Symmetry: D5
Subunit: 167 residues, 10 copies
């Protein structure tokens, strides 16, 4: 059963992420004081260019300049994430990336967030906006075929921040 | 608990809607053969301009030109919906509108779509994209202070229709 | 199930009421030391003139001069109550009113009083007489098509007060 | 628990009544095709004048002329009812009466109608209005010290009949 | 279910009795230190002469002279008991009587003693002999058509007292 | 629990009885068409003369001449009943007897009649009057020290027969 | 169900026994410090000579000379046991006997030792050897037609006592 | 739970036995038409001479000449039984033997017969006499230290056979 | 909980494998008529040389020449397996391989074989030998730091085939 | 159900073993501080040469020189193990042996290790490698016809010790 509810604390997670090419333990609470865009994608190493992850990474400062961080997550192992990062974009790899890739190998994070697909063994395309107090503000769930927009994500983050300030 | 699951038939609903200023019985199955943008908003007659509903109403041909209908819903009675429509926009009303306003007075529809707020008695801001075969493709849930984008909604419908065709 | 039982404390309620054009928190316990006539009606903004609510409001001093207050309640939001108050009587509205209009948006009050209609999402016409000690003395439940009498209500209040004094 | 619910069939009853000084088997269904005013009172042979039963008997033709019957019930035996009737009014009795007095000796009718007082062994003052199709239309429950009004009962019956015919 | 068991404490009872034409609170425990003959009969005001109650009243001194009291009970109200007593014997009444008449209006005493007839709402003819320590010594249950004997009751009470003293 | 209920079929029993010095199978149904006095006593061979059983046997024609039979029962074996019968009265035995002595060695009959004492392993003194149709009409339960009266038993049988005829 | 298990304390029992023609309270714990042969037989006063009980009685010194007591038990009352003892052997009695005859009138002892016959109401032929520390050492159960041997019982006691000493 | 009850069919068993030095499947039903002495002993290959098994085997014709067979059983495997039979008596072995040695390796037979010792993993010394119709007639359970007598077993078999014939 | 039991059908599995650089559906029953060595390893793309997989790949003809196939499985996706195969050995890839790599992305195969590590989200090193009838013959489970031996695997397979043919 | 789990404490066992021709109590924790190879085999005294046990016995110094002990276990009693050891190899015995033979007569050790065959009453061929801290490192289960390899067992032990020391 999903733990993710709007206006309640975002469900706690921890696990191993690849950050600047290294394995680091990462925890939701590491982001307190900041907004967090926390998003899931199905699988590393598929035959489709990972356009949506590349967009977030390549535009990361439009988030960081407004006190917002981004973390991407799939059910792949941290070893697979690293191998994918070390595969050049021109071979369909991710290439070097400035966003943590969190591993959800046990599937517990995906199940807690309601994005796990039992019959397939990976997630759908789920995106969560979590405020600086750790409260879940937004849930976006897409069927597999359709990606997320950085511009829409920024719009939502900027609006939650505006409304936090001018209540 | 919520019955809305991506890739499954969207939860059936029926109720009274205000359409072109008249009460009409409306059913989810009335939309079979078309895409449907089905969204919830909290309450009629609040002190905030209904910008988002006005936007979908002004830009409705952009959906209809791609075989897509739009339905809005709140927990308000059909009588309240009709009064809000009949209240001019400059007096805090909605004014004439081209999108059906569905009443979920029993709260069953809101509960089935996972958008009902037990402590408040109305919905959060939830939007669902349902395809022409009645299958749920997309779920967007926003905390109360933040509205929806017609552009983003349009991009998602177009992308689902594209991937349906060339999938 | 209904908690309203003759000779027991009337079930506690609290919510937002419209009182002289403003939102106020109102509680049952605010009425200790006075008799209270507490009545439900189905919906704001219907096509029938609200004759029964108008009568209680317009004859309110016949209650106040015998240490009795009146509170009307429906499942409509406080925003809808306010819009209805601000709709002139000769356009079908309530117009200005002296009696509080309590919102039961969550349906919990209506359920506690055994007046909620599950299939419709609103109440029947229920009226309750509560004494100055908070004890329920009288229950009147009418099917939808038939309203209440101010004169019968006064007879009942006067009889309970008389028997309280000379029992 | 009470089976009496507005808009549902009134709970079936049968038992022995005193009608014109004779024991008769009486059933709720005997009244199909007519409105019925069915009321309970606590006990025979108390030291209070039975004003309300006398008023209903005195004014019975105002009910029969609008296709309505009246039945009174208490938990007393039929033998008690008959003795009370046979006791002159000045001597603490009811005297002759044209309203059936139904015995609820088993207490089952009083429990089904939600008027039984478990700590006392008799009912409070409950009155019920049942239509010609056997559907419950109105529930009135009074704490012991306050009686019912023939005029109010007539107003209710006339309104239900008018709305049945004219909507 | 019945709580009356030979050699166990007789089930506790309390209620309102008519004693010498007055309402009095009566308790089983009021009789500690004496034997008690406690009997039930079905109903007041039937068309049968109440021969057995009259016989017990007529011969009461044969009990009091051996430290024994007698109490009669039916499901009728205390108000019924008083009216029956106040109705002359030739006129269908009991007339004046020196035995308390206990009301079991709630039916709880009759159920505890196993004498209640659920389909009728009154008791069969049960008689119980309770010693000075409050211990049940004897149960006599008769189907409705056959009464009790004062002589047999005296024989039983005298035998219990003789065996209590002489073994 | 006891199956013996006034106005219902007396509980079925069968067992081995001593009848005129011989073991015979005896069943309740053997007595259809006659009234039956069926009574239990605690134990054979105690130090008290069996006066009550002797009285019923010695006065048996006062029952037989009014179409009534008598059966005595205890928990003793049929072998013990026979030895007791073969013990002269002036040595404390029963001597020859005309009434069957039923054995309830398993305790099932005693339990069915609600006369079994769990702590002692025998019955109290219980007596039952059963009509010619097999219906239980009367129950008499005495604590151990006090016996039954042939004369009271005849009065009861005669009363039930009289009311059966002229009810 | 049976509580008798080899190597565990023999199930506790107590009851009234006939010892030297007098009633005595007897308990299993009275035998602590001695071996005990505890055996059951079906019924007193049958038409079979009580050969086996007579044998244990005639040869009782052979047990007492090796610190061993013998107790016999049936479901018969102590009163029946005493009568059977007082009946001369030539008239189908037991005659004077040196072994206590324990009564198991409630059947609890038989049930605890696993020897009770539910369909018959008495025991089969069961024999138990209990050591001086109260532990059950041997269980012998015989269908009704076959008796026990004193010699065999003696061999078992002697063998248990031998192995106790040189174990 | 033990299935072995006197007067009921002996619990069914089957398994591998050593018979004349060979493995044979053996079943309780193989013995229909004959009495069977069926006995358990703890373990093969202990340091005590198997005197009691040797006695049964060496005196086997005192059983077979009266239509009676003997089977011995332990929890040892059939391989261990065979190895034991092939160990000479002068080395504490069984030597050649004419009685089947049944293996109860799974423990199901021992548990069905109530002879299994959970803490030890083998049986106690249990012996069962089963008649020619397969009915259990006798149960003998000995604590470990004490053996069975062939002479007692013959006495019991001869008595069941005598009583089967002269009922 | 594990379904894998020696001498029972090996648990059914199906999924996507990489075979000669392509995705192919594969199921357990594809191997009916052949022996199957089915083994799990923790993870692709780790920092330890995949020596054991390379060893089975290199020596695959020693299996095929004795009617035996080999399948390897981890929890990694098929896409990851393909990427790992397409990574040269000199960069910590597997390189070209002749053994199918099965994906257990859902973890259901691993759980069914009892090799899944709930705290880690991958398997330990389990190896299973399944015969040509689909029956499980051998289970080998190694803690993570220790690998499997092709020589020991071949010994086992040959011994099962030898014992299948020669009893 | 099996308690044996890789990386968890090996299930505790205790019982009687034969060590150098004598009975000794043995428990798992006697081996703390050493590696233990713990293995089960089906049965003593079967017709197949005990080659694998002889092999571990013969090569025991290869284990002891790497701080490792070896214990073999079957369901046979200790007495049977001793008899099997005392039977010369040339007659299908084990002969002298340096490995403890543990008895699992109760079958509880076998069940705890998941090696027990309920239909047969003995184990399959299971082998367990337990480290010096008592943690289970390896499980090998073979169907009955195939034995274990000392060489593979030594490879595993050495690899666990190597990986324990060098990470």
């Amino acid at each position: 059963l999903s733990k993710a509810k709007i206006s309640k604390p975002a469900p706690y997670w921890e696990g191993t992420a690849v950050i600047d090419g290294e394995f680091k333990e990462l925890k939701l609470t590491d982001y307190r004081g900041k907004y967090l865009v926390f998003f899931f994608y199905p699988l590393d190493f598929t035959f489709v260019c990972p356009t949506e992850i590349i967009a977030f990474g390549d535009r990361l400062e439009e988030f960081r300049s407004i006190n917002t961080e981004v973390v991407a997550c799939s059910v792949d192992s941290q070893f697979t994430h690293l191998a994918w990062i070390n595969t050049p974009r021109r071979q369909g790899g991710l290439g070097p990336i400035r966003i943590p890739l969190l591993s959800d190998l046990t599937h517990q994070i995906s199940k807690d967030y309601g994005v796990y697909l039992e019959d397939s063994g990976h997630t759908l395309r789920g995106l969560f906006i979590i405020d600086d107090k750790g409260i879940l503000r937004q849930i976006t769930l897409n069927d597999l075929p359709v990606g997320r927009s950085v511009d829409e994500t920024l719009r939502l983050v900027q609006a939650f921040q505006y409304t936090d300030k001018h209540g």
